[PDB]
Enzyme design. Structure first.
Site, PDB file in Angstrom:
ATOM      1  N   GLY A  56       0.815  -1.213   0.000  1.00  0.00           N
ATOM      2  CA  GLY A  56       0.000   0.000   0.000  1.00  0.00           C
ATOM      3  C   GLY A  56       0.847   1.261   0.000  1.00  0.00           C
ATOM      4  N   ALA A  57       1.755   1.340  -0.967  1.00  0.00           N
ATOM      5  CA  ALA A  57       2.815   2.362  -0.998  1.00  0.00           C
ATOM      6  C   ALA A  57       2.313   3.799  -1.072  1.00  0.00           C
ATOM      7  CB  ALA A  57       3.766   2.103  -2.148  1.00  0.00           C
ATOM      8  N   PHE A  61      -0.227   7.248   3.667  1.00  0.00           N
ATOM      9  CA  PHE A  61       0.502   8.367   4.307  1.00  0.00           C
ATOM     10  C   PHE A  61       1.799   7.868   4.901  1.00  0.00           C
ATOM     11  CE2 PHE A  61       0.195  11.595   8.056  1.00  0.00           C
ATOM     12  CZ  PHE A  61       0.969  12.521   7.408  1.00  0.00           C
ATOM     13  N   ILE A  62       1.714   6.940   5.849  1.00  0.00           N
ATOM     14  CA  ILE A  62       2.893   6.339   6.434  1.00  0.00           C
ATOM     15  C   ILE A  62       3.753   5.693   5.341  1.00  0.00           C
ATOM     16  CG2 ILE A  62       3.745   4.497   7.870  1.00  0.00           C
ATOM     17  CD1 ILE A  62       1.356   4.990   9.699  1.00  0.00           C
ATOM     18  N   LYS A  64      -8.338  -3.617  14.101  1.00  0.00           N
ATOM     19  CA  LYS A  64      -6.894  -3.512  14.278  1.00  0.00           C
ATOM     20  C   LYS A  64      -6.380  -4.611  15.208  1.00  0.00           C
ATOM     21  CE  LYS A  64      -5.807  -0.117  11.582  1.00  0.00           C
ATOM     22  NZ  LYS A  64      -4.979  -0.368  10.356  1.00  0.00           N
ATOM     23  N   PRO A 100       1.680   2.599  15.688  1.00  0.00           N
ATOM     24  CA  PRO A 100       1.548   4.069  15.697  1.00  0.00           C
ATOM     25  C   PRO A 100       0.203   4.522  16.244  1.00  0.00           C
ATOM     26  CG  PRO A 100       1.471   3.244  13.465  1.00  0.00           C
ATOM     27  CD  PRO A 100       1.659   2.042  14.340  1.00  0.00           C
ATOM     28  N   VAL A 101       0.214   5.747  16.766  1.00  0.00           N
ATOM     29  CA  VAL A 101      -0.993   6.428  17.203  1.00  0.00           C
ATOM     30  C   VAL A 101      -1.487   7.322  16.068  1.00  0.00           C
ATOM     31  CG1 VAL A 101      -0.460   6.213  19.633  1.00  0.00           C
ATOM     32  CG2 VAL A 101       0.454   8.156  18.358  1.00  0.00           C
ATOM     33  N   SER A 117      -5.874  11.241   8.390  1.00  0.00           N
ATOM     34  CA  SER A 117      -5.385  11.632   9.698  1.00  0.00           C
ATOM     35  C   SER A 117      -5.182  13.146   9.754  1.00  0.00           C
ATOM     36  CB  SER A 117      -4.113  10.866  10.067  1.00  0.00           C
ATOM     37  OG  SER A 117      -3.070  11.141   9.168  1.00  0.00           O
TER      38      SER A 117
END
Length: 317
Positions: A12-13, A16-17, A157, A180-181, A195
């Site tokens: 999933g490139a 965001f992350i 999750k 991560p949060v 986010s």
């Protein structure tokens, strides 16, 4: 120069992350195979323009539900960063299928290590945990509780990470997990991800008040660097909570207003009756002990706004 010729897959490139992870991997000299559902789609254009992408980024068409597509991306990789676990209650089912597929393909390809992107959603919600207990990697959320309270984000999750461990143990894969949060930071994409939308509503004046609640925040570049640290550190093991600060919404708007007095940021809480929710305590010591330095949330919010300005999502007076 040490990692030249090392090949890693990022699922999933375009996320965001994931986009930041690809960016930094490329900078460090990695060869990267990034999965997206449609490489020719213009929304992945930002990836092709990253430094090193022409030479060293291969965008692989794959779907988490399509095992062969994932095998084709992962075959020949030394490592896999499984960042795509899409969690409506709709999200719960597919994040599990994809996770199983990715781990199984990694096993068949004899990958050295998989880093799995989990979430605070797999950690926080547990009614039987004392609210004063420091939240850390030993904390798992309670799926029965989340299912019953219709907290499908937490449910999905938790079960996705649970599935990751089960599949990795079954297939003998070295799996490390990062949790991560709420991630903030500058955008690489033209569009605003979910986010960062959390901050945008305050700056446009659409939110006329802020809510009585708290959340943990972390910078997206820290999260990306942490993924790499977990991959590269032989002794890394288990889960790693990736968070810098817990803030009340009120603390967040205060920070934004002091930096950007020109925007119509709300100044009043929507709930005037009940007392201010207190930030919970947590520990990021496990990641600090590996050497990660965390970006202060103030800096992260500042950079987020400056990026929204640069990308044309906010006016610059």
């Amino acid at each position: 120069r040490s990692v030249s010729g090392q090949v890693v897959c990022v699922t999933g490139a375009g996320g965001f992350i994931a986009s930041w992870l690809v960016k930094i991997l490329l900078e460090k000299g990695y060869t990267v195979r990034g999965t997206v559902r449609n490489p020719d789609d213009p929304k992945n254009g930002h990836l092709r323009e990253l430094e090193g992408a022409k030479e060293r980024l291969t965008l692989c068409k794959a779907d988490l539900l399509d095992y062969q597509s994932l095998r084709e991306a992962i075959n020949g990789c030394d490592g896999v960063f499984h960042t795509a676990s899409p969690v409506p209650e709709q999200m719960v089912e597919p994040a599990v299928i994809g996770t199983k597929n990715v781990i199984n393909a990694a096993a068949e390809a004899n990958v050295r290590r998989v880093v799995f992107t989990s979430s605070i959603g797999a950690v926080y919600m547990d009614p039987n945990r004392d609210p004063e207990t420091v939240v850390d990697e030993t904390c798992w959320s309670d799926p029965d509780f989340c299912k019953n309270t219709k907290n499908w984000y937490c449910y999905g999750k938790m079960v996705a990470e649970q599935a990751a461990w089960e599949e990795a143990k079954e297939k003998g894969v070295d799996l490390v997990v990062i949790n991560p949060v709420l991630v903030q930071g500058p955008l690489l994409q033209t569009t605003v991800n979910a986010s960062v939308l959390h901050i945008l509503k305050y700056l446009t004046g659409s939110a006329k008040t802020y809510a009585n609640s708290v959340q943990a925040y972390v910078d997206v570049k820290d999260v990306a660097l942490a993924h790499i640290l977990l991959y590269e550190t032989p002794e890394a093991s288990g889960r790693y909570l990736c968070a810098e600060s817990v803030l009340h919404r009120g603390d967040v708007v205060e920070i934004l207003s002091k930096f950007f007095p020109e925007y119509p940021i709300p100044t009043k809480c929507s709930d005037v009756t009940k007392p201010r929710v207190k930030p919970y305590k947590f520990s990021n010591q496990k990641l600090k002990d590996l050497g990660l330095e965390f970006t202060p949330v103030k800096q992260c919010l500042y950079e987020t706004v400056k990026s929204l300005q640069e990308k044309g999502h906010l006016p610059i007076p």
